[PDB]
Symmetry: C4
Subunit: 387 residues, 4 copies
């Protein structure tokens, strides 16, 4: 029966290693698929890894050029947790160069987007059959979250942007129930630009932390009520800035406008915004997608003077990172929702020229009420072995 967001978040007093696939290490001598934009998403019975295939293996010739985002040869695949995404084990969800996928308790909705830049469309699959289709409304790269959505009693909202990336676009919040559109609504609130939303839910409410590609170095937040099918947006108030590139941390930050400093750029990220129990991930570097850290900044959302009270490094500054996103196993046993997250560890081009490809690995963590010690989690491939 349909899942219902009835619990709240657990106390995050630290994070533990949940998954890790070592795909590029293993990809050096096995038939692993060139991927990017990963995520993790849970069924009632298993959790799996998800990414967009580039339709080729790493050591295969046709990997030269996989730095490009959109093509006819990409697809959404999922595979068993902590396994490299291989040719013989992956399952294709749908054919597309942007995606999101979530399970509603009853079965799973997966949405892939394809097309030329000016004539793209999305197909909503539900129970591995195509159900519903939607065309560009603004005719400029229709795109979605690049991580799992969240349902509540049958209703799974999904954020789409169609339009410019260096200026105003058109963002809709669609509400689906059984693959069918119930309703949609234009973006609202005070966020000036939305891209790559990273979402979760507890106590009958959904929270996405997205990406202002055009103006903000602080991240905008969409908060959705899946029952009333309404939403609102805002930015994160705290001055611990968390996009990338980003200027240095000020002592005061914006609640309702972009923080200026970098233009027309960023990276996918997430946050868990739960009062004093609020954490933020970011690249350590303000210039590259390098390093990854979590920071506990009580009332980040609303207290525009907040600064960290505790922290944890996931990946060292000398290691490469990339996208990151939220997920939770809503079907886990127990009293509260244990928060999880993933970082994409991109290897290859641009930052590593000697090779002609671009892939990534994954590392996944979930929280602990314990105060566990920390390690760091590099991709661990040796690029010279690919030369």
């Amino acid at each position: 029966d349909f899942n219902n967001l009835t619990k709240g978040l657990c106390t995050i007093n630290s994070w533990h290693i949940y998954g890790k696939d070592n795909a590029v290490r293993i990809g050096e001598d096995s038939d692993v698929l060139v991927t990017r934009e990963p995520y993790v998403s849970c069924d009632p019975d298993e959790c799996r890894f998800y990414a967009l295939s580039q339709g080729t293996t790493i050591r295969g010739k046709h990997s030269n050029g996989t730095i490009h985002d959109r093509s006819q040869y990409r697809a959404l695949i999922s595979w068993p947790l902590s396994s490299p995404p291989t040719v013989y084990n992956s399952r294709v969800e749908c054919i597309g160069w942007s995606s999101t996928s979530c399970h509603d308790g009853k079965t799973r909705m997966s949405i892939c987007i394809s097309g030329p830049n000016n004539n793209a469309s999305a197909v909503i699959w539900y129970n591995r059959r195509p159900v519903t289709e939607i065309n560009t409304w603004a005719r400029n790269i229709l795109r979605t979250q690049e991580s799992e959505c969240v349902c509540h009693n049958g209703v799974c909202p999904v954020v789409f942007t169609d339009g410019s990336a260096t200026g105003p676009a058109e963002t809709r919040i669609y509400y689906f129930k059984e693959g069918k559109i119930l309703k949609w609504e234009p973006l609202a609130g005070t966020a000036k630009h939305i891209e790559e939303c990273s979402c979760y839910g507890e106590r009958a409410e959904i929270t996405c932390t997205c990406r202002d590609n055009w103006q903000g170095s602080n991240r905008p937040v969409i908060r959705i009520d899946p029952v009333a099918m309404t939403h609102t947006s805002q930015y994160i108030c705290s001055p611990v800035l968390t996009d990338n590139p980003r200027p240095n941390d000020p002592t005061v930050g914006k609640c309702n406008d972009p923080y200026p400093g970098n233009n027309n750029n960023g990276v996918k990220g997430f946050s868990y915004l739960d009062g004093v129990n609020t954490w933020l991930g970011r690249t350590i570097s303000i210039a590259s997608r390098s390093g990854y850290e979590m920071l506990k900044v009580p009332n980040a959302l609303t207290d525009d003077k907040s600064k960290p009270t505790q922290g944890q490094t996931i990946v060292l500054n000398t290691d490469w990172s990339g996208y990151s996103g939220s997920f939770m196993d809503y079907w886990a046993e127990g009293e509260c929702y244990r928060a999880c997250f993933y970082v994409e560890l991109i290897r290859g081009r641009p930052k590593e020229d000697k090779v002609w490809w671009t892939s990534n690995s994954i590392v996944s963590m979930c929280s602990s009420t314990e105060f566990l010690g920390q390690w760091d989690w590099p991709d661990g491939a040796k690029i010279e072995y690919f030369l």
Copy 2:
């Protein structure tokens, strides 16, 4: 319980990408099987891809010569949708160099044909056991559809041709129920030659669009009543000609004879013939198996002056195509049968001499009542990487 063709076709206002496997791209660096004559066919619970193996991998030595149609080393395999047909994941349906396979609601019938040219025979498997066998009646390459049949309340008819390909042959329409022959009947109507029939059903009626190899550039149609176990044949009236090679589109076409122009040749194709809601696929080229397009030609079947009112390009003229065929997921949720189809994208010999093999990829589409934008769907392998 046995499936029953009780719905009608949905409104096709465009086509969306359904599947795609990138096998030859991926085949460059994985253990993928050299195949041809693909198709797609649905079970109650999953849809899969189907093709005849050449009993060898692409990069394997024994791929030299896979331009030949019939041998002891071919087989019907199926695999998970949008996966390349690999050595470690394919399932063998039966041993044969021609085939068809369909599910009757209760379980699946798969028919492979083998033998020398003058002493071939077919074995009807049902529930993965062999049940019934049939010998050449005309002792000249017994052959079937090369795509899924259609049942209705237990009764799955299948079209076979035995005889010449450049002249008169003998075509029987067999009716099976549980793998057993109920009845068969010689071809009737006004079609002069039948090969490679592409079939579907709605509202208790079955429609195959086949191939006059010897005379016609317009395609003959067999229409079957699975309840009365009778059939009839005809040609498509419209002058938008759809075999290949074919002469140029006239302004008037034959309802009951072949349109002349090319002799002793053609390609497998399909159509959906549903009044004003009628669509036709064809190669864009009139000379090569190149490009693929869909065209909406209201009353193609019967109105011998009809010309397109809307269209969609699946594969550009500069890309290679090949066979194409119909399928529908009869077990999908909803009110009408959503029409689907596939194009085989042949690579290698003849048209690509530098290599000694012949394989293919797949792209599959299904309809949408939406008016979606279009992309094009090349195989996307780079043949020079195989040199």
Copy 3:
């Protein structure tokens, strides 16, 4: 519930291709396992292929020397029908250099034998757990059938030989029920030597056709009653001789002694002995394991003057063959037991020196009451591609 041999054999008016794996063709460019002594055996729900692994892939270095029968690195594996026996898909039944395996309706018994030549022992697995063990009684290569046994209402007898191969040995017929020994009895009748028994059952009776390695060129037959747990042996009377090497067909043959001519040698074979409905497989060559043919010799068992009344070539004389054996899908739908059989197609050493290995492929057939045309079924690998 336990299976019961209640039907009789169907009319074999010809044989159809049932399975074929092309393993050595495919083995040239995939991770397939070096095997030998194959067979096919059925569960209630699927039929699979079975062979002894040499613990190495064909293209792998450790394939040099796989001409040897017994070692610590062999195992019984099974895999999905008509798939090459690959490293990633095979299942290990047990660890041993001789075997047999059968399903009793309830679950499956698999028996592997290992050890040094003078201290070997057998372990009876049942439901994938080890249950019962048996030591050499004559301390000279304890060995079993190399193909599936047959049960009836829970009771599966198995023939073992312990002793010399060029002279008298000690052969026991063990009766198992649920992996446990019910009883065993020394060989009886007039057969002078028993090896590699090939068995089937209908109408509550079991028939094995085995191998006199030391004296006979005509094949001895053990007939078992699984209910009374008694047996008897005999030779086949007909002069269509069917071991190999063998002298030429006489006009009269032995019912109760070996036919002389070749000493201390032979090959695994089978027959179906059902009155006028009696068929015999053999190598076409009297010198090599080459070619394979079926011959219909009414009352072969008992009429010592019988000669063929119809025939079918499975493999041409110019192609290599090897072991062969009986199986039937006792759980198939229908009124009679449809007879099946397999031929091992050995490649490599001895007869093909240029390579350092010895493997094989499979071809499987089952009967048809039809009179189907015939093809021939070579392994189809090109040994030069391995050089």
Copy 4:
């Protein structure tokens, strides 16, 4: 429902080959994973193999350096019995460089440990979800058994050591029920150092035989009562010494102190201590991890003058061995628990310098009340083929 240790051990009158994977042989030409610290562990329905991945294939470049125990790229994997641990077939249990895993009748608990040496922590997974976490208490390489634990009516105790390896450490016995900690207690008894405990249970009692790394050449034993959740420790009295390196067998040995001779070293081992029905495995060499033998030494535990009355060689002195451990299929049919065990056959570095890696194979045996003949079970790879 929860499993309950209600039977006793069967009579071990010898040991039979149970499993064997030939991974390094097969690893020479397939995508097998570099592993070590294997074990075998049973579910209600299947038994599988288990080891820590080094996150790389043997023939892959990133195998250079896999002599190191702890890193970010290790994981616990399991795979189907007697299959090589391959990239496409393994399942990841959890991310860690030390482990144990057991099934409680209802579902399976798997515990992996990761971290830097001075800030490691353990996560207890249960039903493939993370449940409970535990941090270093002594801040010096927190480590567990490296083989399966044992439950009884829901309660699975596990031994952990945190501290020095060449001196006093801190060892806790934790009691889990459903992944949750019920209780834990410091080590007690007269054992001076505990590492790598190898455990089993019958008649409602649990017996681990562990490793005094710092002082003893005789092995300490922890005996646990899972109902009263108490334990005690002791050493094995017999003078048939069974760690490695070890001095030569004295004529009298310690019941309550270490036997002196080698310092700060050893290897994982096991014993079955059941009165006159007591067996001990060890390396044949007293200097290297070479050879493996079983010895029947009645009342080893308690009779400090005991010497072997019967024996069996598993691996010859000229072959390499390594860790070894106990398991039993508690869900097997029958009256008593049949004892099983495994030996890790390490290949590569240190003892084999020509290669830059370190992997292993497995051989598994279980007992027989029979008196079966013996063979020996080398890994069987040829290291020169890797040069």
